[PDB]
Write a protein that binds this ligand. Structure first.
Ligand SMILES: [Cl-]
Ligand SMILES: [Cl-]
Length: 88
């Protein structure tokens, strides 16, 4: 289920990679860098980003989401949800 990750930025950023699907099927955490603030905050590769700093970002573009992340200098809180099950 969705969960909040509280990140404090380091000198090399947060240490995660955000990957977008053709608009606007969502933004996902592709990679979490070892030893990074993202790893410390327990963000996980595969996570879908649901909120940034308390605002729902489902249906926003990659740029909108990145801008929200950058909006507050030095910290961000990401509500994310992993996906373990799909019926295809
Ligand atoms: Cl996942
Ligand atoms: Cl996960």
């Amino acid at each position: 289920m969705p969960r909040l990750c509280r990140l404090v930025r380091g000198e090399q950023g947060y240490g995660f990679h955000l990957h977008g699907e053709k608009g606007r099927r969502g933004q996902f955490i592709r990679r979490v860098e070892p030893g990074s603030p993202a790893e410390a905050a327990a963000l996980r590769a595969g996570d879908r980003l649901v909120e940034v700093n308390g605002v729902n970002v489902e249906g926003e573009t990659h740029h909108q989401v990145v801008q929200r992340i950058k909006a507050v200098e030095g910290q961000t809180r990401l509500l994310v949800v992993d996906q373990m099950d799909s019926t295809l």
